[PDB]
Symmetry: C3
C-alpha cells in the first residue's frame, strides 16, 4: 500500500515552559525573556568610565579629605560608584547641608573641572593660611586638612574683616563649597579669631545666608568636640559670589565648574572595575540590555530591562515535544526524523520512503512567531534612567514613598510578565495545532475520494502513488486508475 502522512517536528530538546493550562510542558524550541545573569564587574556606560570614589564617599571626595584622590583637571564620568560604608568623608565632624541634594546634583554632570577660586598664596594677606591643620584630618601620620578648603586663623593678634568675591566667567555652573567652624569653648574662639562674636556672610544673585558660630561642649567625634558645618551653592554663569567674615570661615580654596548631561546616578558596589562596555549597570555587575525583563537588582543605571521578581520567563517558539485536535490528538506524536521544518509529510510507496517538511506552512509559522517574539521584546520602551534615590534620617516618609513606587512597578511588571508568558505560550501551541490541522484538511480536500482516511493523520491511496504524484500533492496541484 501507498501512504502520505502529515505530521510535525520532534527533537532531543529538554526545554520546558509553563502555560496557562499546564505546567512543565517540554517543547522543541523556546526563547528566554529574562536576564538573570551578570558579569560581576563595573563597566563603562555610554562610552565613559564611572567616577570611582574608592575609600571615600562624596563628602570626603568633594571636600578633599586627605585620604581621597584629587581631581586636578577636567574629567567626565557616566555614573558614580562609591563602595559600601566608606569611612573617609568629613574627617572633621559637622553637618553637611543638603548632602543628598548635592549627591543628586553630581549625578547629572557630564564634565567637571577643579579650579583655584581663592588662591591660598595670595588671597588672604592679613590672615594666617598655614596653621589650619588638625589631627582629625591627618594623612600618612601627619596632621592636615581638606584640600579644597582653607581654615583661616588670626595673624599677629588680629583676625581682620575679610571680603572676597568671585565672578563666574566660566560660562557654566560653578559649585562653591565652604565651611563654618564652631569651637567647643570660648577660649578657642578667642585664640583663633580674637573675638567672641563673629559672623560669616555668603551672597550671590540667588543665594544669601548668614552664619554665627555657636559655642558649646559636645561629645568628641574623631577626638574633636568642635564642629565644622559644610555648605555649598551653585553659582550661575556670570554671577558673583561674595564672602564676608570676621571669624570662623572655612574658606573656599578650590571650586568646580560643571556641565550637565543625562541624569545618571550613584552605584554602591563592592564590584571592581573592568574594561567592559554596557548599556545597563547594576550594583553586582553589568547586564545585557536585549531582553525586556531582569531579576538581578531593582536599582539600575542605563537603558535597562524592567526588574521582576520572576525566576523563569521562558517563551515557547516551537511545539509540544489540543485546542484544534491534531497535535497530541489524532496525530499523537512528532517525527524526530523530519529535521527540516515544523510541519511536513511522510511518504511510503514502492519507489522509496522518508520524511519531508512542508516549506510553505513552516515558513509562514516561523515568520509569524518571529514577529511575535520581536513584539514582546521590542515594544518595551527603554529610556536611560537611574532608579536610585537617597534620603536622610528625617526623610523616612520620602524614602518609603520611593520604596512604594519601586515596589508597585515591580508588582505590576512581575504579574503582567508572568501572565503574558503563560497566556501567549498557550496561544503559540494552539497556533501550531491549527497549522497542522489546516495542512491535514488541505490534503484531505485535494484527496477527495482517491484515498482512505486512516485517522492517524495519514491517508492510504487507492490510486497508485509513486514518488511523482506526491510532489504535485505537496505542491497543492491534484487531478482527482482505481486499483
Amino acid at each position: 500500500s501507498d501512504t502520505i502522512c502529515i505530521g510535525y517536528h520532534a527533537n532531543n530538546s529538554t526545554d520546558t515552559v509553563d502555560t496557562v493550562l499546564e505546567k512543565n510542558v517540554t517543547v522543541t524550541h523556546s526563547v528566554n525573556l529574562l536576564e538573570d545573569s551578570h558579569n560581576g564587574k563595573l563597566c563603562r556606560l555610554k562610552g565613559k568610565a564611572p567616577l570611582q570614589l574608592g575609600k571615600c564617599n562624596i563628602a570626603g571626595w568633594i571636600l578633599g579629605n586627605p585620604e581621597c584622590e584629587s581631581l586636578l583637571s577636567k574629567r567626565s564620568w557616566s555614573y558614580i560608584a562609591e563602595t559600601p560604608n566608606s569611612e573617609n568623608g568629613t574627617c572633621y565632624p559637622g553637618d553637611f547641608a543638603d548632602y543628598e541634594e548635592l549627591r543628586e546634583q553630581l549625578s547629572s554632570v557630564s564634565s567637571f573641572e577643579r579650579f583655584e577660586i581663592f588662591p591660598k598664596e595670595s588671597s588672604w594677606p592679613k590672615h594666617n593660611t598655614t596653621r589650619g591643620v588638625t589631627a582629625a584630618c591627618s594623612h600618612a601620620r601627619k596632621s592636615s586638612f581638606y584640600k579644597n578648603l582653607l581654615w583661616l586663623t588670626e595673624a599677629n593678634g588680629s583676625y581682620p574683616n575679610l571680603s572676597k568675591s568671585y565672578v563666574n566667567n566660566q560660562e557654566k555652573e560653578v559649585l562653591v563649597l565652604w565651611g563654618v567652624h564652631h569651637p567647643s569653648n570660648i577660649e578657642d574662639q578667642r585664640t583663633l579669631y580674637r573675638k567672641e562674636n563673629a559672623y560669616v556672610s555668603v551672597v550671590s544673585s540667588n543665594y544669601n545666608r548668614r552664619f554665627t558660630p555657636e559655642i558649646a561642649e559636645r561629645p568628641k567625634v574623631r577626638n574633636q568636640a568642635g564642629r565644622m558645618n559644610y555648605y555649598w551653592t551653585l553659582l550661575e554663569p556670570g554671577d558673583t559670589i561674595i564672602f564676608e567674615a570676621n571669624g570662623n570661615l572655612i574658606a573656599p580654596w578650590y571650586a568646580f565648574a560643571l556641565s550637565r548631561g543625562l541624569g545618571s546616578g550613584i552605584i554602591t558596589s563592592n564590584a571592581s572595575m573592568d574594561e567592559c562596555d554596557t548599556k545597563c549597570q547594576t550594583p553586582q555587575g553589568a547586564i545585557n540590555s536585549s531582553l525586556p525583563f531582569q531579576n538581578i537588582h531593582p536599582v539600575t543605571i542605563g537603558e535597562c530591562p524592567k526588574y521582576v521578581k520572576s525566576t523563569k520567563l521562558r517563551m515557547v517558539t516551537g511545539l509540544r515535544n489540543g485546542l484544534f485536535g491534531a497535535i497530541a490528538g489524532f496525530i499523537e506524536g512528532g517525527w524526530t526524523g523530519m529535521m527540516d521544518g515544523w510541519y511536513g509529510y511522510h511518504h511510503q510507496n514502492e519507489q522509496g520512503s522518508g520524511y519531508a517538511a512542508d516549506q510553505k506552512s513552516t515558513q509562514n509559522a516561523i515568520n509569524g512567531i518571529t514577529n511575535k517574539v520581536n513584539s514582546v521584546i521590542e515594544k518595551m520602551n527603554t529610556q536611560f534612567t537611574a532608579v536610585g534615590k537617597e534620603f536622610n534620617k528625617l526623610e523616612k516618609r520620602m524614602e518609603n514613598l520611593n520604596k512604594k513606587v519601586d515596589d508597585g512597578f515591580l508588582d505590576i511588571w512581575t504579574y503582567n510578565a508572568e501572565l503574558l508568558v503563560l497566556l501567549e505560550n498557550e496561544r503559540t501551541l494552539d497556533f501550531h495545532d491549527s497549522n497542522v490541522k489546516n495542512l491535514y484538511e488541505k490534503v484531505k480536500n485535494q484527496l477527495r475520494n482517491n484515498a482512505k482516511e486512516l485517522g492517524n493523520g495519514c491517508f492510504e491511496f487507492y490510486h497508485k502513488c509513486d514518488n511523482e504524484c506526491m510532489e504535485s500533492v505537496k505542491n497543492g496541484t491534484y487531478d482527482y486508475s482505481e486499483e
Copy 2:
C-alpha cells in the same frame, strides 16, 4: 449546474493594523484608540475657566507687581495658566518662601476675594507710607512698588515700634502676605529705619516667625543690592495675625479671602483661552477623554486618557481586505467579495433564474454586536481619576523632581507596553473570530446539503439537483429540505 458559495466582505478601505503574527494588515474596518489631536486652546475644567496670568507669574500677580492686572471682583478658577513669557514676578530681588507650595495651593479656588487688610491711608499714622517706591518696580517710567504691600519708612526722624493685628472674620481662609527688607549697607538701614538692629515678628495661632535684617554687600539684581524676602500664611477663620516690627517690614496692604478646592495645578501654555468645556486640559490644548490613550502630552490636568509613547493604536473591527487560524478566510475561501456590500459574511448563488450576492444577516449581526461590545470594553473599562500631573520643585528639591519623573515615566512605560500589546493581540483575536464565523457558516451549509451537492473546496457547493430561488432561500435561512432531493 447550480451553485451556492460562502464568502466574506471586501471594500476599497486602505486601513492597516498590526497583529502579533503580522505587521501592516489591510482591513475593511477599524477603530482608533489613541487620541492624537487637541483643540489648541485653554478650556474650562469642571465648569470654571482657569486663571490666566499673561505677562505675570503667580508671584507678581499675588504680590501685585505694578505690571500685573489686579483682581477687583470675587472669582473662582479650576486651574492656573501662565505663559512662557510670564516674566513679571518679584521686581525687587529676594526669596519667596515656599513659593511652589503656594502655587499648588492657589491653583484651584472656589472663591477668591482681594480686600484691604490694613488700609494704607489710616493704619500707620506715625510712619511714612508714601516714600516706599523703587525703580526696580517701575511702572509707566516712574518708580513704584507692589500694589498689595506697603513699604513703611521712618517719618520725621523716627521709625516707631508698630504692633498691628487682624482678626479673620471672613468665615474662610485669608491669605496674608508680607515682606522683610534687607539693606545692602548700614547707612541705608539708619536712613530708612533709624536703627541698626531691627526685627520683624509675625504670629498667629499656628504661624510663628521672627525676622532680623542681614546687611551685607550683594551683587545687584534689577540694579538692587538690597533684598526683599517675601512670606505668607493662610489665616484660618476666626484666627488673629499680629505684626510687630521696629523696622524693615514690608507690610500687608491687601489680603485675599479664599476657599480652596480640590487640588489642581499650573499649565504653561501660549494657547489662547476659549469658551469651551473639557474634562482634560493639556499644555498645547484640550483633548477628548473618550479614548483610553493619548500621545499629546504627559503633563495633563483632569480626567484624561493615559499618556503613551505610541504613534498609532488602530484596532481592527472588520476583516482582512482581500478584494488563518480556522482555515477559511485566506484559506480555502481565499478572497473577499466587493459585490457583497451589506454584510460581513454571506452567499453567492447562481441558478437558472439569476445570480447575485446576499449577506447572511444573522451571523453578520452577531459579529457586529460582539466586535461592538469588544471595542466598548477596551474603551470604557478605563478608569481615569481626576489628576494634575505637573509638579514644581525648586533648586534644592532635585531628588523630589527625579522621583516625580520616575513616577510619570514608569506609568508611561507600563501604559505604552500594555496598549501596544493589547492591540497587537486583540487584533489577532478579532481576525481569528471572523475566520471562525466564516468556517461555521460554511460548515452550517455543508451539514444542510449532506450529499445533494459536491464540495468544490473553495467555499462553493455544486448542486446535483436543480435549486430554484425558494430552494436557495431555503439554504440561506437554514431550512433546506434535504429528503426532498435525496
Copy 3:
C-alpha cells in the same frame, strides 16, 4: 435504531460573568476574584495587636499629655490606630518639629521602653521642678503638664547654668524629646528664668542645635500666648547627648529605647478592636487576603490584595448554562444536559438494553485540571509584600501629598483596567475552550463510527448496526 449523543453539562446555576464579546452570560461554575467584604473590626497583624491611641494623637502619647496616661504602659505593636476623635496632643501650644517624620518613625517600632532619662527628683538640685504646671494641660481639674517632660524654673531668685548628659547604654536607638519655652512678654521671662537673654543647647555626635527664646505678643491658644516648641532626636547606641541651658528649657524626664520592626503604619478608624487575626487591615475593617484584588479601601496595612475600583470580577470556570468559536456549544449541539451530573462533557446512549447519561472522565478531568491551573495562576502570581500605603503630610507639603496621591491613583488605574480586561478576555478564552473540548469529543466519535452510523446533526449518531453496551463502552472509551 440505536443512538449515541455528545453533549455538555447544564445545571440550575444563575451565576453570570461578562466576556469580551458578550455581557451577562449565565454560566455553570465560576470563581470570584474580588474581595468586597470586611469584618468591621481592628485586628492583630503578624500576631500583635495595634496600639490604640483613642482620644489621643501621637504627639499627646509620645509627650505624655496628662489625658493619655493609659498609653504609657503599651510596649509592642504591629500598627497604630488613631480614632477620628484623637484630639489630645500638644496641650501647650507650639510647633512640633518634624512631627509627621516622627509619626512615620514610630510606625516601624517592634519594642518600646519608656525610661526615666533625667529623674525629676534628683537631676535638678538648683532649679524648681514643681512649678512647671499649667491650666492648658489640666488633669482632674488641676493644672498639670506632660508626663515625659519637666518644665524647669528659677529657684530662689536665680536660674543657674545647667549641663546634663546622657550616655545611650540601651544598645538600641533612644528617642529623646525636649522643648523650648517662648514667653509672650519679658516680665514672664524674668519671672521664670531671671534672665532676659537665655539660650538652650542640645548636642550629640550627630545632632547640634542652639535655641533662642523669642519674646513677642501672640494670640492665645488654650489661653496661652506663650509657646513651647517640641523637638526630638534619635540617639545612636553608645552616643552621648548633652543638654545645656540658662533658661527656657523643657527638659527630658522620660525617653524611649526602641527597636525597629517591619515598616508599618497608622490607621484612622472608628472600628473597635476584636480578638481576630488578619494579614491585611483596612480602616473600616480587616479583609481576607486570598484573592488578588479588593475594593474596600486603597490605604491598607499588611499583605494586601491590590485595590481596584471594580465592583465585580467573576471568572467563569464552567460552561454557558443552557438548561461559539468552535461551533458545538450553542451551535449544532444547541443545549446542555441537566441529566449529566457527573462531568462537564459526556455521552447519552440509547439502545435495546437501556438509556442514560455518562460523563467522559478523561476529557472532563483534563479540562478541570487545566481550568484549575488557570484560576490558580491568576491568583497565585500576585506578588503581595507587607506594605503600609499611607503617607501623612503637613500644611506646607501639599505637593508631596499630591505626588503620593498620584502614585496611589496610578496604581489603582493600572490594576483596575488590567483586572477588568483580564477577566473579560479570559472568560472568552475559557468558554472557547469548552466549545473546543466538545467539538473534539464529537469529532473523535465521528471518526470512530465512519460508515457505521448516520450523523443527525445535533450531536447524535443513529447506529446502523445494533450496538450493545460493550460496543457503546468501546466507543466511549475509544477502543
